[PDB]
């Protein structure tokens, strides 16, 4: 529709949805906050997603140089307090863990370098508290009865849960997204593949791309090689159904 | 092999080279349709076609015939039919007009004993202006865009870079066909041999920098993308998919046609157009389009990002994410004075019956919050009426409370439904009033309501006449037909009246299990006519019917107890409404039930959900409302130099530990962006942002 001024490899909102981080094809990431570019970085960026605001305005950039840069808020050209460059292979994506589980970032290169920062104020140190060896999805569950889970996609989804007893984590897939629960007793999984797939876990006709879940995890936006951002949603029978088609060019 | 070639100008025109030339206009069905404008068949055995880059004259095709003669067919009248002929006849492989000088027409020919292959003609029979390359076969030609005169020619065994200034760097390799210099990167060249395509670097012209994937079938055409920042689409023989091996090297494929593809053509002007020609001349225009990086927003906006443009959908149904925004904007739920009007403040029959139920629980309080099912467990002293006696206090203390929760009787011990009837007539529900009046054993009042209703705003007159003939004889004519014909009535409340009348006394299953009648009326009816043994079994059946279905109207039966959490869990699972879940589970629920993990977590989502919508002040109202209902969920100023109504607040900066009176501090920070105290650089107001 409204083609605001901005090749953006990945564009993602923050928690409040008032600032947009876009990773250009020229190895640059910009915080496009009438979206006007309010920053310029030159990156070092396959995926750039924000962090939870209470943890600071941290943007995680996954590059092809076998590193996962994390640009931390220092007011504008944000200074990299930390640099998670310990990954042997290129970081496919960098998605922060939910705020309840602490400052954890996942870089599903296959080495899931789950870097944890014990000091919130001093995030310059990244500790690989866990390491399990295309898409990285985090479970937004914060329940006492729901253990934290980390999902890894391969270009085909495996969920690793940090079991309390052991205190340790235990068609090609393009992007995996977990819907926000909002007290649900089940999890809805959206996986980007040759065909869009939706699955329930209860305790385009082409190559799909980074599908995202809304703030409530009910209406779905699945994009693919067809060039049309099709909007999906549930139905009266609690089943996935098409809810609309949006044109990328704005028609 | 048929070929498609976009014209340098006239962005709506293209020529599909075949056994006979044919110029189409983009208006067969290309997508859009193609209308033929001209057809030239006077140049048989054509093997090379190249557009005239100069504007005048337009549509000038240098058709390289199989005998070596280049015919400048017009698909400045001097440059029409020109028949440039080589010294010795042989195949003409490739033609390429120089972009810097569009009147040279570099021609590539096959082998010969002592005749030059790569002839640089002069558009101006003729003689070559430049003849470079002897005893070889120039398979491909590509003028370097930067230099005026440097044609990189693919000979039989080398990629010779012929310098027209001095008629030569050669790299002896097997990849010598289809040389195409990528426009944006003038130092990168492409060439394909059999099934492999190689990417070269003119600054390091010694070895191929990159050797792309070797497709099984041999490649037929490799062309760079003049629109993107480097996208070497690689056609393959007998392949319906264009392997767009992007050298930016992410590999992608596009299948625009169901049949094999002869040759494609990128549009120089159009943004990445992909005109595809099948051997059956099925000219289809496909479009590549960069991958869309969708990402929702809390306001439900899909920032579709295609290429370098951010197309924000901006919510271009009433989804639950969108629904809550309008609810919270109108202070939904928080208006806990007219609880029966909360659904009105909500802008749903389930929600309408839920808020009435919660209002009745609030009204009676001002064991009831345990729900109808727990209230009727201790109900004792139930009597069954064998015969319907047409005219309440005989009911138990639990039953009379249940009717109040169903709204049938007013607040108190008044054994009557008369005030309830008057409201229904005022509210306009005329068929419901007749049913409610009848259920209190009053035919005449039911007839009067229907007759009064039919008089205003005429079928209710006949229903009154039909209701007036209630005969209790087992084999009566009335019961024989009214029971059969009751199913053919529109309003459910009219149907249940005859269902209740014609049913054998004791088993009123024709009315107790009618889903089109409000649950409160059915439960109120059940409390009056069912015995304790039958009522408890029925309520347990109805409780579980709303328990699994996630019905808000089942809050009446389940109540705000452990079962109520289970029911409201199903409602959340079915729909996803935590805003309704948080408010309803906070209104009078007991501490033990409200201490459950699910209900506490339902609040945690909604507060976190309501934060993303920037409704902080609205959230502050919820926390204040929640705290009251849930007790278990609990220096000197730098300007005026005065030591420690909002202006008297003492602002302490978390960074530099400086600050003072709010009124003074805001005034200083209104026009300045530095800490007012001396020798301080901290921007206290701008730091938090
Ligand atoms: Zn002061
Ligand atoms: Zn200061
Ligand atoms: Zn002061
Ligand atoms: Zn300060």
Find the distance separating the first CA and the last CA of chain B, reported in whole Å.
64
B602: contact with A, CB 8 A cutoff? yes
Choose among B543, B547, B536, B544: nearest CA to B557.
B543
Residue whose C-alpha is closest to residue A222's, from B230, B513, B294: B294
Q: What is the 3-state secondary structure (H, E, C) of A103-153?
A: CEEECECCCEEEEECCCCCCCCCCEEEEEECCEEEECCCCCCCCCCEEEEE
Vertex B424, ends B422 and B425: CA angle to 5°? 65
Contact (CB, 8 A) for B88 and B112:
yes
Residue of A nearest to B613 (CA): A16
- What is d(CA A242, CA B22) in angstroms, rounded to the nearest whole number? 43
Assess whether the previous peptide bond of B57 is cis (omega < 30° from 0). Answer: yes
Span from the CA of B143 to the centroid of ligand 1 (angstroms): 75
What is the least distance, in Å, from the CA of B511 to any CA of chain A? 26
B296 touches chain A (CB under 8 A): yes
Strand A2-4's sheet: what is its strand order?
Answer: A2-4, B309-312, B303-306
CB atoms within 10 A of CB B247: 22
Instruction: Tell me the count of A-B CB pairs closer than 8 A.
Output: 189
Other CB atoms closer than 10 Å to residue A204's CB: what's the count? 19
Residue B128 CA to its chain's centroid (Å): 61
Nearest residue to A87 via CA among A61, A108, A116: A108
- Phi, psi angle pair for B263, to nearest 5°: -160, 140
DSSP codes joined into one string, B599-632: HHHHHHHHHHHHHHTT-HHHHHHHHHHHHHH-GG
CB of B605 within 8 Å of a chain A CB? The answer is yes
Q: Which of B56, B75, B92 minimizes the C-alpha distance to B16?
A: B75
In sequence order, the β-bridge partners of residue B253 are B243
Query: What does the block give as tokens for B97?
Result: 């007009």
Ligand 4: distance of its center to the CA of B673 in Å? 10
Strands B106-109 and B92-96: antiparallel
Burial B9-42 (b: 16+ CB within 10 A, else e): eeeebbbbbbeebbbbebeeebeeebeeeeebee
Q: Which of residues 23-62 of A touch B (CB under 8 A)?
A: 24-25, 32, 35
Task: Determine the Cα–Cα distance for residues B655 and B99; give it in Å rounded to an integer.
Answer: 62
CB-CB under 8 Å, B295 with A12: yes
Residues across chain B: 689
Residue B260 φ/ψ, nearest 5 degrees: -65, 155
Distance from the B74 Cα atom to the nearest Cα atom in chain A, whole angstroms: 36
Cα–Cα dist A1/B313, whole Å: 6
DSSP B587: S
Resolution in A: 3.5
Q: Which of B295, B345, B385, B351 is nearest to B577 (CA)?
A: B351
- Could you report how far apart the first and last alpha carbons of chain A are, in Å? 6
A143: closest chain B residue by CA: B601
H/E element holding B641? none
CB B32 within 8 A of CB B285: yes
Do B221 and B236 form a contact (C-beta atoms < 8 A)?
no
Per-residue burial over B308-333, b = 16 or more CB atoms within 10 Å of its CB, e = otherwise: ebbbbbebbeebbbbbbbebbeeebb
> Can you state the angle between helices B492-502 and B459-467, rounded to 10 degrees?
10
Q: Are B669 and B685 in contact (CB under 8 A)?
A: yes
Q: What's B454's DSSP letter?
A: H
Q: Using a CB-CB distance cutoff of 8 angstroms, which residues of chain A are in contact with residue B327?
A: none
Residue pair B3/B262 in contact (Cβ under 8 Å)? The answer is yes
**Chain B from 194 to 223: CB within 8 A of any A CB:** none
Cα angle at A23 between A17 and A29, to 5 degrees? 90
Cβ of B114: how many Cβ atoms within 10 Å? 8
Which chain B residues are within 8 Å of A214, Cβ to Cβ? 296, 300, 319, 321
B231 close to B180: Cβ distance less than 8 angstroms:
no
CA B506 to chain centre: 54
- In the Cβ-directed half-sphere of A208, how many Cα atoms lie within 13 Å? 27
* Backbone phi, psi, residue B424, to 5°: -65, -40
Measured between CA atoms, how close is B557 to chain A, in angstroms?
A: 22
Burial B552-590 (b: 16+ CB within 10 A, else e): bbbbbbbbbbebbbbbbbbbbbebbbbbbbbbbbbbbbe
Can you list the alpha helix ranges (DSSP code H) found in B428-491? Answer: 430-439, 443-455, 459-467, 477-485
Whether B92 has a binding-site annotation, put simply, is: no
- Half-sphere exposure for B206 (CA within 13 Å, toward CB): 1
Neighboring chain B residues of A207 at a CB cutoff of 8 Å: 252
Give the CA angle between residues B110, B116, B119 to the nearest 5°. 85
Distance CA B371, CA A249 (A): 55
Residue of B nearest to A64 (CA): B249
Which pairing describes strands B232-236 and B263-266: parallel, antiparallel, or unpaired?
unpaired
Q: Is B684 annotated as a binding residue?
A: yes
Query: In this structure, how many other beta carbons lie within 10 angstroms of the beta carbon of residue B394?
Result: 12
Among residues 90-149 of chain A, which lie with CB inside 8 Å of chain B?
142-145
Contact state of B612 with A16 under an 8 Å Cβ cutoff? yes
Torsion angle (degrees, nearest 10) of CA A31, A33, A35, A37: -40
Q: What is the Cα–Cα distance from B92 to B118, expressed in whole angstroms?
A: 9
The SS3 call for residue B511 is: helix
Experimental technique used to determine this entry: cryo-EM
Structural contact between residues B9 and B20, judged by C-beta atoms closer than 8 angstroms: no
Short-list A61, A50, A57, CA closest to A28? A61
Supply B532's token pair: 């304790």
Q: From CA B315, how far away is CA A1, in angstroms rounded? A: 10
Tokens describing residue B446: 């039911």
Q: Is B680 annotated as ligand-binding?
A: yes
How far is residue B233 from each of residues B196, B224, B251, B392, B651, measured CA to CA in Å?
Answer: 13, 6, 10, 85, 62
Contacts of A102 (CB under 8 A, 6+ apart): A116, A117
- Give alpha helix (H) positions in B486-561: 492-502, 509-512, 519-529, 532-549, 555-558
- The encoded tokens of residue B96 equal 């390429």
* Cβ(B263)–Cβ(B281) below 8 Å: no
Residue B77 CA to residue B7 CA, distance in Å, equals: 19
Residue keyed to tokens 């310059």: A124
DSSP annotation string for B147-195: SSSEEEEE-SSBEEEEETT---B--B-S--EEEEE-SSSTTEEEEEETT
Q: How far is the CA of A81 from the centre of ligand 2 (A)?
A: 23
Chain A residues close to B272, C-beta within 8 Å: none
**Cα–Cα distance measured from residue A113 to residue A67, given in angstroms and rounded to the nearest whole number:** 11
C-alpha distance from residue B404 to each of B371, B372, B412, B413 (Å): 12, 10, 8, 10
């Amino acid at each position: 529709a409204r083609s605001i001024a901005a090749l953006i490899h990945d564009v993602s909102f923050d928690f409040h949805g008032r600032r947009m981080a876009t990773c250009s094809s020229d190895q640059s990431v910009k915080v496009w906050d009438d979206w006007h570019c309010t920053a310029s970085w030159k990156t070092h960026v396959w995926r750039v997603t924000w962090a939870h605001p209470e943890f600071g305005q941290v943007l995680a950039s996954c590059s092809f140089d076998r590193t996962a840069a994390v640009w931390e808020e220092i007011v504008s050209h944000w200074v990299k307090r930390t640099t998670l460059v310990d990954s042997r292979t290129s970081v496919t994506d960098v998605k922060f863990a939910p705020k309840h589980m602490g400052l954890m970032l996942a870089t599903c290169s296959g080495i899931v370098r789950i870097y944890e920062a014990p000091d919130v104020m001093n995030l310059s140190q990244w500790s690989l508290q866990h390491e399990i060896s295309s898409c990285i999805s985090w479970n937004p569950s914060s329940s006492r009865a729901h253990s934290p889970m980390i999902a890894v996609g391969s270009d085909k989804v495996q969920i690793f849960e940090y079991n309390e007893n052991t205190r340790k984590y235990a068609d090609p897939v393009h992007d995996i997204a977990f819907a926000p629960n909002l007290g649900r007793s089940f999890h809805i999984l959206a996986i980007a593949t040759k065909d869009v797939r939706i699955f329930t876990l209860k305790p385009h006709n082409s190559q799909v791309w980074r599908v995202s879940w809304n703030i409530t995890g009910t209406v779905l936006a699945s994009s693919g090689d067809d060039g049309c951002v099709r909007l999906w949603k549930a139905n009266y029978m609690d089943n996935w159904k098409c809810t609309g088609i949006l044109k990328g060019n704005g028609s | 092999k048929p070929d498609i070639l976009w014209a340098p100008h006239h962005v709506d025109r293209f020529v599909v080279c075949d056994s006979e030339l044919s110029l189409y206009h983009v208006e067969l069905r290309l997508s859009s349709a193609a209308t033929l404008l001209s057809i030239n068949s006077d140049t048989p055995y054509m093997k090379c076609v190249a557009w005239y880059l100069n504007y005048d004259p337009e549509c000038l095709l240098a058709v390289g015939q199989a005998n070596g003669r280049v015919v400048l067919t017009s698909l400045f009248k001097d440059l029409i039919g020109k028949e440039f002929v080589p010294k010795h006849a042989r195949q003409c492989n490739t033609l390429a007009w120089n972009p810097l000088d569009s009147n040279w027409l570099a021609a590539g020919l096959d082998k010969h004993r002592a005749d030059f292959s790569v002839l640089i003609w002069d558009i101006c029979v003729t003689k070559p202006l430049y003849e470079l390359g002897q005893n070889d076969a120039c398979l491909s030609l590509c003028w370097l865009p930067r230099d005026q005169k440097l044609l990189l020619a693919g000979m039989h065994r080398n990629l010779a870079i012929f310098d027209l200034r001095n008629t030569k760097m050669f790299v002896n390799t097997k990849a010598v066909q289809g040389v195409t210099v990528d426009p944006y990167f003038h130092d990168r060249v492409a060439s394909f041999y059999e099934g492999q395509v190689a990417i070269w670097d003119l600054r390091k012209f010694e070895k191929p920098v990159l050797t792309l994937t070797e497709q099984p079938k041999p490649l037929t055409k490799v062309a760079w993308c003049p629109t993107r920042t480097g996208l070497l689409a690689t056609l393959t023989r007998d392949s319906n998919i264009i392997r767009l091996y992007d050298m930016q090297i992410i590999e992608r494929s596009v299948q625009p046609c169901d049949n094999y593809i002869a040759s494609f053509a990128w549009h120089p002007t159009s943004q990445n157009r992909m005109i595809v020609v099948t051997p059956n001349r099925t000219m289809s225009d496909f479009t590549v389009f960069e991958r869309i990086s969708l990402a929702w927003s809390p306001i439900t906006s899909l920032m579709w990002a295609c290429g370098r443009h951010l197309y924000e959908c901006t919510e271009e149904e009433k989804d639950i994410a969108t629904k809550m925004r309008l609810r919270a904007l109108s202070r939904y739920g928080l208006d806990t004075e007219q609880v029966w009007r909360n659904h009105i403040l909500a802008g749903d029959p389930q929600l309408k019956s839920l808020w009435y139920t919660l209002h009745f629980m609030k009204q009676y309080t001002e064991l009831v919050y345990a729900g109808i099912k727990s209230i009727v467990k201790s109900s004792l002293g139930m009597v069954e009426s064998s015969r319907h006696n047409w005219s309440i206090q005989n009911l138990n203390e639990e039953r009379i409370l249940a009717l109040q929760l169903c709204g049938w009787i007013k607040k108190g011990t008044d054994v009557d439904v008369g005030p309830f009837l008057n409201s229904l007539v005022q509210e306009g529900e005329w068929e419901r009033a007749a049913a409610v009046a009848l259920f209190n054993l009053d035919i005449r009042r039911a007839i009067q309501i229907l007759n009064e209703g039919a008089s205003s705003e005429l079928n209710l007159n006949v229903v009154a006449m039909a209701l007036s003939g209630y005969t209790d004889e087992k084999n009566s004519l009335w019961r024989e037909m009214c029971s059969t014909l009751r199913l053919q009535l529109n309003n459910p409340y009219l149907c249940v009246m005859f269902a209740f009348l014609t049913s054998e006394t004791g088993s009123y299953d024709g009315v107790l299990y009618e889903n089109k009648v409000a649950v409160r009326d059915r439960v109120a009816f059940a409390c009056k006519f069912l015995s304790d043994t039958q009522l408890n079994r029925y309520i347990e059946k109805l409780t579980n019917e709303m328990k699994e279905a996630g019905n808000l109207e089942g809050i009446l039966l389940t109540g705000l107890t452990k079962d109520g959490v289970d029911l409201m869990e199903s409602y959340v699972d079915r729909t996803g409404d935590v805003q309704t879940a948080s408010y309803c589970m906070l209104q009078g629920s007991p501490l033990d039930v409200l201490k459950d993990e699910r209900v506490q977590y339902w609040i945690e989502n909604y507060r976190n959900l309501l934060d993303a919508w920037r409704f902080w002040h609205k959230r502050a109202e919820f926390d204040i409302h929640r705290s009251k209902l849930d007790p278990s969920s609990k220096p000197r100023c730098a300007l005026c130099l005065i030591n420690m109504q909002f202006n008297n607040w003492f602002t302490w900066c978390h960074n530099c530990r400086h600050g003072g009176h709010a009124g003074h501090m805001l005034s200083w920070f209104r026009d300045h962006a530095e800490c007012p105290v001396s020798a301080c650089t901290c921007k206290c107001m701008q730091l938090d942002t």
